[PDB]
Amino acid sequence: KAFEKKFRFDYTNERALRRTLQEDLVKDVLSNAHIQNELEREFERMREDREVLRVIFPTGDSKVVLPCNLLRMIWNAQKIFHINPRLPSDLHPIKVV
C-alpha cells in the first residue's frame, strides 16, 4: 500500500493535480489517454523491478553502492535553478518518462 501510494501518480483526484502541476498541464493529463497508458506502464515496470529487487536482496537491505548520487544531484539542480517548492511546476510527467 505504501509503495503504491508513493509511486502510483494518481491522475484522478485532480485536486492534487491542480495543487502540484500547472493548469495548462492538468487539462492535458486529464484529457489524454496515451499519457495515462504510459503512466500506468511506468508503474507496472516499477512493480516488476520491485520484485526483481526483492529476489536479489532478501533480508531487506536497502543500502547499496552505485556510481551516481541521484538525490544529491537533484538537490544541486533545485539550488542551481532556484526552484520554489511551494508553487505548481511546468514539468510534464510524460516528458519525465
Binding site: 483526484n13 485536486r15 492534487a16 495543487r19 539550488k79 532556484h82 520554489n84 511551494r86
Partner: protein, 148 residues
C-alpha cells in the same frame, strides 16, 4: 518600505531545556494581537534579555528605508542613506525553510519560517496570511528594541 513583518513580543522562557551555550540563549516568545510563537537565539552578553521583557520585532528585506537592496557586502562608510538605526539589536540572516500545514488537496493555513543568522537560528510560526513575505534563500534582517 521592505518591512516583511512587525509585531510586539513577550518573553516566556529563556532556556526551557537548559543553558546549552555560554554566550547564547534561546528566547521562547509569544506574540500580541497576532498569536505568533517565536523561538529566537540572542547573544545575551552583548544584548542582555531577562524574563517578562517586551520588545518590538521587525523583519525587513532591506535596511535602507527606501527599497534598494544591499548586495550583502559590508561597508561601514555608508551613513548617507540613513538606514533603520532606531533599533537596538540588528541581525542578518537567510531563510532556509518554510514549513507549512498543507495536505494533498487543501492549502495551508499556518506557516513556519526558519531563518539562520550565521548560526543563530529563528523560527516564527503563525498564520499563513501575514507570513507571505518570506521566500527561501532570501537575505533577511532582524531588528529588536525593548519597550519600557
Amino acid at each position: 518600505a521592505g518591512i516583511l513583518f512587525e509585531d510586539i513580543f513577550d518573553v516566556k522562557d529563556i532556556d526551557p531545556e537548559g543553558k546549552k551555550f555560554d554566550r547564547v540563549s534561546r528566547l521562547h516568545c509569544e506574540s500580541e494581537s497576532f498569536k505568533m510563537d517565536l523561538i529566537l537565539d540572542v547573544n545575551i552578553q552583548i544584548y542582555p534579555v531577562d524574563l517578562g521583557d517586551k520588545f518590538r520585532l521587525v523583519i525587513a528585506s532591506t535596511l535602507y528605508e527606501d527599497g534598494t537592496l544591499d548586495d550583502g557586502e559590508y561597508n561601514p562608510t555608508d551613513d548617507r542613506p540613513s538606514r533603520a538605526d532606531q533599533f537596538e539589536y540588528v541581525m542578518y540572516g537567510k531563510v532556509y525553510r518554510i514549513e507549512g500545514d498543507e495536505t494533498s488537496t487543501e492549502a495551508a493555513t499556518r506557516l513556519s519560517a526558519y531563518v539562520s543568522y550565521g548560526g543563530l537560528l529563528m523560527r516564527l510560526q503563525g498564520d499563513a496570511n501575514n507570513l507571505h513575505g518570506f521566500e527561501v534563500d532570501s537575505r533577511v534582517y532582524l531588528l529588536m528594541k525593548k519597550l519600557a
